[model samples]
Target chain A: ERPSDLVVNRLVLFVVKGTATSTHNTVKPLILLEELGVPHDIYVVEKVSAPWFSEINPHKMVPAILDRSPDGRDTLRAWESTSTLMYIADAYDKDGTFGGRNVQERSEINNWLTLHTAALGPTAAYWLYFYKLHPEKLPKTIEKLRSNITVQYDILERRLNEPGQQYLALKDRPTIADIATLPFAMKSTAELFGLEFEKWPKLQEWSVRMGEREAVKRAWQRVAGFGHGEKEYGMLE
Target chain B: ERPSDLVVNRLVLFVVKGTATSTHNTVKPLILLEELGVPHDIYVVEKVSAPWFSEINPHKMVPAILDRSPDGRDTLRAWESTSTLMYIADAYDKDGTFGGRNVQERSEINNWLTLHTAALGPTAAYWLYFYKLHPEKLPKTIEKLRSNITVQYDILERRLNEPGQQYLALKDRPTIADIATLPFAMKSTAELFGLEFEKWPKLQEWSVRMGEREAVKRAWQRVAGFGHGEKEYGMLE
Candidate 1:
């Protein structure tokens, strides 16, 4: 049966098929959504490059969304994982629970957020993509990529090791900056590369701590559900 | 002679010298500061890894800032090019002239901003670094890097050509999204790569138009002033 207009305003997350091994970036927004307790659905975009999907994200990438106002009177679109976090934070985090409350708080959060996008994510994505998934690989490219990842990790390590610094942006609690980086830093990143996390013990611990969050654990499971076609509109109930 | 504390709270921009051909990223925040009419000074950190500089940016990169409140009582430090743009916008752009005003505006601006960081800047940097700056260059790596740049360019080209969409985020005016991207998308990026900008005519026109802005022009001149050791505390006058 077709769903009626009662829930027409629910958020729809367009993502690559759930089973794909490299859904870490897509999983990022899912983690935030689960943390925010937002009402949303995962529309596993099996055909991401379709013109229809392109309309949603002109780049034809996953982890994009359509946020319809509860009155169903307005629909807003957003893509890019970090951007999605910002959008959700601004729209839903009325208490400033995760988004920064002051100018200093916002700036620090943004610095780490952009650093993840500019430096860490690109380097790690290629490391993983060319390491195995792609048909072609370059030994030198992989070497350089992993080297950059090491530098990025060192930055995070020192930040975490700083006096009284438990999170990347905030002093104690995690923010979107931490969430934006978790999927890439958690067990999945280093284990796949065969690198030793012990080298960056503080970063390793932060990853583990973030992964331990109930919201984060559920987000991973929900992503699996998308990958395997296990559920739909799960947030409706 | 040292002046009195009348200007004790002017912003201090820590940047790599301008003469470095690679100052495009550092020049980004300069553009925003000029656009926002913010009072600031450039403190060229010649030895980036010096302990003092490291405290400002542990990553030892330039394009970081020290925003001392006018009263000299509060100081906020921020780094990373896009993050710097965000900090400058939030702290200085009170009217939302460049920063986003509403949820849609902010989300769209942020999406493009992160895409520049996640996709464009990293690709172009390595393409430039390896092609000439670095000691080693791989034909395969160079080829792949160029291929990704082309994909990124096409996305921008299409965005510019979208019906009635003049700027990246807003309908008519340029936001920090445009500011974050201009330096790389300007003549510097493609020219060094030996790629023809003619292929992406709309993007090319947008680049030229953005460069023509008085603030953009002034930013480049100010960066050059720093690189050449020509001016100091120009904003104070």
Candidate 2:
């Protein structure tokens, strides 16, 4: 939208249907990009019989980007959703707004995102799958996931409940890292796997405010075909 | 030793006993440092106790470093081994000969290293645990670990066995990524897990060559408690 800024000529957003349903595991970058309000093209990868999908993501994963390079080769690449968020924030962010302003801040952002992917994201996904998707194998896996989630939750709960810092950033402004992680934390409570987020009232409040943003809402609509196809609001329930 | 071209400083080696027995996955960065002839100190965490080692790594992990920061705040603190490799290469090696030349190359280096951590290192560690350390839980977790490890291994094998680019670098020479990955990949035959390195011969051979380096060998001895523990090899192992 900003004509004065550098515009990517052939930016393509690779989308797969039902991807939006797996909100507990992915779907942060799409929200960030939509929020960033950058002009780009979108390509929805057909879930069934999409033979050429592997050429882009060897693993046949979704949410890839094909950016035109200086040499005229379209770099067809795929990474998990969170990494894509980091790449976008690092690469295309104007004024480095979402990433950080300086070394310490960037380091914090990186550390927080790493914590999101390494700790919160995986644990939450495992619990959800065990409870909902694969209920037969739920005993041990769900237990382990619960234990780990509690450990991390204690740490995050402490940080959120602390008096000084209101938002994830030092100040009130929510950065990309916050946006990147908010989806999973918010979704953990939606499916009723018995995960109690309300215990951490501050985090719960923060999650609600973040999830309501128009950007996040739009991104959620965009990735409608990723998981169990009931309806758009089915995921929210 | 090469004082004519670079400034001389105190040499330090880092050594830490990993939880698992096999040294193949623990000696990667030492190989790179030996290759570069970088001087440093070694601190090995023998007991594998996170509480005891928390002072060194606030995140409570292994393979941390203390690089001389220009700000003179003692030194730059690094917790993860992957982070250590990146810091050493970026700070000590002014030339791009080892890691790649630019930001994109560095990103590639990081991308692969992340794959190693997020996939291989964890896979190999769990394999060692199930196969070597605790067989009782093998039946319980093997299928799960196998499905996970096999998927990751297939991904790596496909890329490494790519008609060319035998290693991960965009160019022919090895980068921080290759070195960072060598430790974990070297565990192809480690333990009785029946890991078939020969299945991925290119990666196996590349890993072995990296393991045979003098610095890596020396680091191995110290970690294995072979000699005076830091006489020639300062790394903890």
Candidate 3:
């Protein structure tokens, strides 16, 4: 059926753990909702208590959202931090920044977004595991994971270094692709290898600028309200 | 550069492990190649050691491809199974069977392929972990993972059951969307969940029919060879 034929019934709550202070993947999408001015509620999956959140998400990964379809259908839910962002943008954002209004623009956004999920996310996960989650055994896999993360960073740095620091998809404003990638790269410096966000100056500026936005700030505030405490997941430590 | 500006150069080999073959996600590009008769080689990464394979691709994931970018640009290398599949099909296919020959078709192919990577793959993965990897935690998460799988299956089943089962994007022939997803659904069977393949009849049939192709058979044979004596990481298990 046409999108026009469909009715908007529910404003989904994107449930996740941590806020901007989160050094994890969970913060990216929540920040996106904040940027789009899209109303959403944050349901923190407390790592210290809720083992059930992973069950709710299956992958045990954070950043899942639920929306009741406009037709009054029961809530539709999706996890996988990247997928959650894409779903909300596709289903709700009519402004085109989140996904884009045209086919090519959207495809470009989708491509990079896929790149983020398929390559960037996995590399970050391994990088953390190699560097933090399994420091003792990191010697066993550190080089491998580090190399992967570096290769990915090389790709992103190249993208950032492109003709005009075109963060993504030739948009005058940031799209979901920018939102998807910026946080990870930002945290890479803040948490992982400490490569210095300044090394990728454009990305660093984009990240700080994005971070300063109200939505990002609000998610951080919500996360604060959720009582994650000032112990930034490693971003500040 | 324009497609016509590029000249043919060297052989591209897709090296992968079949034992890791819980999902058909790895074999996707090759399926489209065989369907469209694109020439390429298949190598088993699991059989090769030296960590060099890991270096070239950088990511430890399977179905990594080494492309002798017909233009003497050295070998273009990458992992992240989804991008590899899309790259090969987009760069090589002529009649638009595997992917598209034009913008519209490519966009649709990308949309579905991204969905597979970003949604289907992770959900299937969590389901796999929930059932197999995290066996100790199965009782708590299985129902949720199983339900997510069903929901994805319903989307697939609905699309396939949409008057025809021939293709995902186009009508009578399978496109990259079909190729990308065929493997994920394959994982839904015993290999992934350790459940009988007979459970989801439509999905089972779709998967079986995909495996019967000459190219898929050839690639599977290569993967199976390495899979024969492949040692388990024993980390998760």
Lowest lDDT sum, 10 consecutive residues, model 2 chain B, at B1-10
* Each prediction's number of clashing residue pairs: 3, 23, 4
lDDT of 2 by residue, A93-197 (tens): 757777666544544455456556545665665566566676367376566667667666665555566576555644556776587567766645533546677
Q: Candidate 3 deviates by what RMSD?
A: 10.8
Question: What tens-digit string does per-residue lDDT give for candidate 2 at B68-149?
Answer: 5544444344444555564566556678766556445544554566566445565555555555555256454555656566
| Clash count, candidate 1 | 3
lDDT (Cα, tens digit) per residue for candidate 1, span B1-237: 222322335677877656647478888888888888897877766577777666667777878887874345567778888888888898899988898877867878888888888888888877877788667778877888888888988898889998987888887899988988887776666887778888889998999989999999988887776745543322223
lDDT of each residue in A1-237, candidate 1, tens digit only = 212422335777776655546478888888888999998866766566677678778778878878874345788777888888888898888777788877878888988888898888888877877788667778887888888888888899989999888899888799999999887776666776667878989898899889889999998886766645444422223
Error of 1 at B7 (Å): 10
Task: Report how closely model 2 matches the true complex, as a DockQ value.
Answer: 0.20
**Considering every candidate listed, which one attains the maximal lDDT?**
1
Q: Residue B216 CA error for candidate 2 (Å)?
A: 4.9
Q: Which candidate wins on TM-score?
A: 1
CAPRI band for model 3 = incorrect
In the predicted model 3, the residue pairs found to clash are A9-A70, A34-A215, B9-B70, B24-B183
lDDT of 3 by residue, A8-121 (tens): 244434343444435355666667777777655444444522444432344445565555644544455556666666566756676777776654355455556667786667
Q: Model 3, which residues run further than 4 Å from truth?
A: A1-9, A12-23, A46-55, A187-191, A228-237, B1-178, B181-206, B209-237
